[PDB]
Curated annotation (Swiss-Prot):
Location in or out of the cell: Nucleus; Chromosome
Misc. comment: JQ1, a thieno-triazolo-1,4-diazepine derivative, and I-BET, a benzodiazepine derivative, have been tested on tumors with success. Treatment with GSK1210151A (I-BET151, a I-BET derivative) has strong effets on mixed lineage leukemia and promotes myeloid differentiation and leukemia stem-cell depletion.
Disease connection: Cornelia de Lange syndrome 6: A form of Cornelia de Lange syndrome, a clinically heterogeneous developmental disorder associated with malformations affecting multiple systems. It is characterized by facial dysmorphisms, abnormal hands and feet, growth delay, cognitive retardation, hirsutism, gastroesophageal dysfunction and cardiac, ophthalmologic and genitourinary anomalies. CDLS6 inheritance is autosomal dominant. A chromosomal aberration involving BRD4 is found in a rare, aggressive, and lethal carcinoma arising in midline organs of young people. Translocation t(15;19)(q14;p13) with NUTM1 which produces a BRD4-NUTM1 fusion protein.
Boundaries of every Bromo domain copy: 22-128
Tissue localization of expression: Ubiquitously expressed.
Domain notes: The NET domain mediates interaction with a number of chromatin proteins involved in transcription regulation (NSD3, JMJD6, CHD4, GLTSCR1 and ATAD5).
Residues under site feature: Acetylated histone binding: 104
The encoding gene: BRD4
Assembly and binders: Interacts with p53/TP53; the interaction is direct. Interacts (via CTD region) with CDK9 and CCNT1, acting as an associated component of P-TEFb complex. Interacts with RELA (when acetylated at 'Lys-310'). Interacts (via NET domain) with NSD3, CHD4, BICRA and ATAD5. The interaction with BICRA bridges BRD4 to the GBAF complex. Interacts (via NET domain) with JMJD6 (via JmjC and N-terminal domains); the interaction is stronger in presence of ssRNA and recruits JMJD6 on distal enhancers. Interacts with NSD3. Interacts with NIPBL.
Family from the record: Belongs to the BET family.
Placement of covalent cross-link Glycyl lysine isopeptide (Lys-Gly) (interchain with G-Cter in SUMO2): 63
This protein's name: Bromodomain-containing protein 4
Entire-sequence positions represented here: 44 to 167 of 1362
Length: 131
């Protein structure tokens, strides 16, 4: 009962080599504190790279989720100074959580994992430094 699975999209872009560099205290906090905390969490592992929805057989994932996002992407974006400001990075974290909550049933393990990361995220974002 084989069906066409299609392809995963290319991973989100993580490099903008000709963007001028600008560090901000908020971007520094996101990289060195927020991302580090979530990355090392026991439930981070499914979120550390783009979801392979094809190989995991997640039906209709790319029809439902218009903007895939993951912490591996966010990490590389931060490291490469891809983000112009901290709100762009926070938007990506939110997109990652939103996608998981939209696609999956509320009881599911992956949702519980995302919720644990989001609770920690919001704790750290509460102490985001002023601009
Ligand atoms: C419950 C932990 C399952 C981790 S997994 O590697 O076996 N499968 C999944 C990885 C990433 C995602 C999902 C999702 C739904 C169902 C299974 C999995 C999903 O939304 N993601 C992206 C976080």
């Amino acid at each position: 009962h084989l069906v066409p699975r299609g392809s995963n999209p290319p991973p989100p872009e993580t490099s903008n080599p000709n963007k001028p560099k600008r560090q901000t205290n908020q971007l520094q906090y996101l990289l060195r504190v927020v991302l580090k905390t979530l990355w090392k969490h026991q439930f981070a592992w499914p979120f550390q790279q783009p979801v392979d929805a094809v190989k995991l057989n997640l039906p209709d994932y790319y029809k439902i989720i218009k903007t895939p996002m993951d912490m591996g992407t966010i990490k590389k974006r931060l490291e490469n100074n891809y983000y112009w400001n901290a709100q762009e990075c926070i938007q990506d974290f939110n997109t990652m959580f939103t996608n998981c909550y939209i696609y999956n049933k509320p009881g599911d393990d992956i949702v519980l994992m995302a919720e644990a990361l989001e609770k920690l995220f919001l704790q750290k974002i509460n102490e985001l430094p002023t601009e």
